[PDB]
Design a binder for this molecule. Structure first.
Ligand code: 0GJ
Ligand code: 0GJ
Lengths: 234, 234
């Protein structure tokens, strides 16, 4: 996260870490005691999920680890476009219970209004060009922008409507590489999933695009209730 | 460990890992649910202890992390001698319960005999010259040798009587740097603590010198029971 500060140790109790033998992959969001939401582009053959993490060097006495038992993607997702319908549900091999540094995030009831202030968080790049990563996750506030700003900022490709356009108009704060899958939270509600953006991040006039969780509510609940044939919003 | 193979995932449940911000420090041994025994030269201002660990890449789901609440050393220990009375007792800040990959090891009732076959284990060097470290702990069987082999082999310093001389005579098997603090187990009994040896491990004729647990039984029991003045055997 570019333009932020170290997150408070208690302000990110729902942030999950996806990693494998090759290291850190992405972030994720725990929505209930058995499921994790993250980005579809973060998928890997094998990986594990780590809960309750703050510092990577100085561990928390309450971290939990689980393996993905099931993974779900939109049935109607475009094969070639890696960020098309960037959402993946992970059914844990074993339930995770609340603790001092672990807790789920509630799904939204309604979508965020243009201009609302939201929180982004992750262990991704903090310097736009350098491959320097934090030890603790960084937090920064950004605003919900008019979707047209993004549509026009990235005219060479199509910015789906099932996405939120967020950031700071003059740049300086934005999610970056390895921040993917993490939550965009507005007023304590789970509103978006970090998906993609500019090169590098934080440039003025190039906001980030987040999967709009709300548009996928029916999908999420259907998959979680047991219906696996649930198709996503086009 | 030089000269062995990867340990079976279930044959090292008492093996603890001491680490800090600078990384890995040493091995250790869980003797009951509240105490860990290790070498005194493994001390560091700040460190933590990890239980139920095997592979550093693929984590077990039952791992536990605790912090050192109290540390204890022999009152009558030599100031400038890093390996004199090489034993340290650590009281955990919170109890550790048994699980698939965590279980304590029992204190000895009698000292091992010369010629006994014992298991050594740890994440220390596997090739004497190369600064290459295992991902999973390596185990190997060595024999308890006549204490005099050590006495003469290391005629350039003095080998205490409160230690076990163990290894293979022609070399090719020994503990190495970063293997310290781990346990020497003979017939399932906790008999020694990895302390020191020659440069580099495995040289023919230069066995490993381990802290003889049996000789400290009283100090250990007195310390754990409450007598913080208990003195060690000279
Ligand atoms: C998977 C995740 O780690 C990244 C997140 C990048 C976020 N970038 C900004 N500026 N907020 N996403 C990608 O690697 C995917 N990239 C693309 O799909 C490109 N078309 C856009 C480049 C980009 O995401 O920055
Ligand atoms: C702290 C612990 O990891 C090591 C273990 C070395 C074991 N070596 C062999 N060959 N089994 N201990 C030390 O680094 C302490 N070293 C000494 O006290 C030196 N007098 C000997 C160096 C040595 O142990 O190789």
């Amino acid at each position: 996260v570019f333009g932020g500060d170290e997150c408070n140790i208690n302000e990110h109790r729902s942030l999950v870490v996806l990693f494998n033998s090759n290291g850190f992959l992405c972030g994720g969001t725990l929505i209930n005691q058995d499921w994790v939401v993250t980005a579809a582009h973060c998928d890997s053959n094998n990986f594990q999920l780590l809960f309750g993490v703050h510092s990577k060097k100085i561990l928390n006495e309450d971290e939990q680890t689980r393996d993905p038992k099931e993974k779900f993607f939109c049935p109607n997702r475009k094969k070639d476009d890696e960020v098309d319908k960037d959402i993946m549900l992970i059914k844990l091999d074993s339930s995770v219970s609340n603790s001092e540094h672990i807790a789920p995030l509630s799904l939204p009831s309604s979508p965020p209004s243009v201009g609302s202030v939201c929180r982004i968080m992750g262990w991704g790049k903090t310097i736009p060009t350098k491959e320097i990563y934090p030890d603790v996750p960084h937090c920064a506030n950004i605003n919900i922008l008019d979707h047209a700003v993004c549509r026009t900022a990235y005219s060479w490709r199509q910015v789906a409507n099932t996405t939120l356009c967020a950031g700071i108009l003059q740049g300086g704060r934005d999610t970056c590489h390895f921040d993917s899958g993490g939550p965009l939270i507005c007023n304590g509600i789970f509103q978006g999933i970090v998906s993609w953006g500019g090169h590098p991040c934080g440039q003025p006039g190039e906001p980030g695009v987040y999967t709009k969780v709300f548009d996928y509510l029916d999908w999420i609940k259907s998959i979680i209730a047991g219906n696996k044939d649930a198709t996503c919003p086009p």
